[PDB]
Swiss-Prot record, chain A:
It is an enzyme of class 3 (hydrolase). This is Fluoroacetyl-CoA thioesterase. Coiled coil: none annotated. Substrate binds at residues 35-45, 64, 115. CoA binds at residues 64, 71-72. Hydrolyzes fluoroacetyl-CoA before it can react with citrate synthase, and thus confers fluoroacetate resistance. Cannot use acetyl-CoA as substrate. The gene is flK.
Length: 132, 133
C-alpha cells in the first residue's frame, strides 16, 4: 500500500567501490575506495524491484524510468547499507517510491525512483531491433 | 571553468554493462533484459563531468558526485555508442552543477541534472579510512 515501507540490507564488499564500476576509466582508477553512487543507485532500485514483485503478472518485468537522489556521505567497504523504499504511487504500469539509505553511521542519500511495468517479450523484440 | 560550455563523452556499451552485471549477487537482476543499467548510466554521466572538470582542479584534488536527477527514457543494448553531453550550469566554491543528457545513436535515453563537490583526495581518503570497520 501507499506509505508502506520495504527495507533491504547490504554489506558493502570491496568490489562495489568507484574503481569497480568502471574499470575501463583511467579517470576513476586511483579513486578512494568508497561505495560508488552508481552502485548506491542500483541498490535503491533493487529494493524497489523486490518491493513490487507481487504486482507483476506472468510475462512481466519492470524498468527504472527516473532516479533523483542525493549522495550525502561516503561509505567504505564493511559497513551495512540499509535502503528503505516507501511506496508513493501505484497506477497501472507506473510506480514511484521515496528511497533513503544509511550505512549504520551516517544517512548516505535519499530521493525518488520511478519504474514502469513492461511485457518482457515485447520489450526484448524492440531491443533486438536497435541491436547492431 | 566556462559556464555553458558543453563536453561530449562517447562510450560503446560492452556486454558487461547490462543490468545483471551491476549486481551479480542479485537474483532479481540476473533475469533482466540485456540492456545498459541505470546505475551504469549514472556512473557514465559522472565520468563525463569528471573529464570536463579535470584541467581546472589543483594538484591532489578530485571530486565526488553529490546529487543526480535524471530520467531514463529508452533502453540500450550492448554495441551502441552512448554519447553523454555535459553542460556546466554553475561553479560556487567547491560545488559544480551540470545539465546532462545521453543518446545512444538511435534514441534519446535520459536527461537531467548532476552536482559534484571538489575534494582534497588524501584528506578525504584518510577520513574515509577512519569510518572503515
Amino acid at each position: 500500500r501507499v506509505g508502506e515501507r520495504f527495507t533491504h540490507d547490504f554489506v558493502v564488499p570491496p568490489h562495489k567501490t568507484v574503481r569497480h564500476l568502471y574499470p575501463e576509466s583511467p579517470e576513476f582508477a586511483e579513486f578512494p575506495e568508497v561505495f560508488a553512487s552508481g552502485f548506491m543507485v542500483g541498490l535503491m532500485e533493487w529494493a524497489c524491484v523486490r518491493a513490487m514483485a507481487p504486482y507483476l503478472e506472468p510475462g512481466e518485468g519492470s524498468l527504472g524510468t527516473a532516479i533523483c537522489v542525493t549522495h550525502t556521505a561516503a561509505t567504505p567497504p564493511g559497513l551495512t547499507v540499509t535502503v528503505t523504499a516507501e511506496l508513493r504511487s501505484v497506477e497501472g504500469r507506473r510506480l514511484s517510491w521515496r528511497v533513503s539509505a544509511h550505512d549504520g553511521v551516517d544517512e548516505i542519500g535519499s530521493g525518488t525512483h520511478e519504474r514502469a511495468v513492461i511485457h518482457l517479450e515485447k520489450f526484448n523484440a524492440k531491443v533486438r531491433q536497435k541491436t547492431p
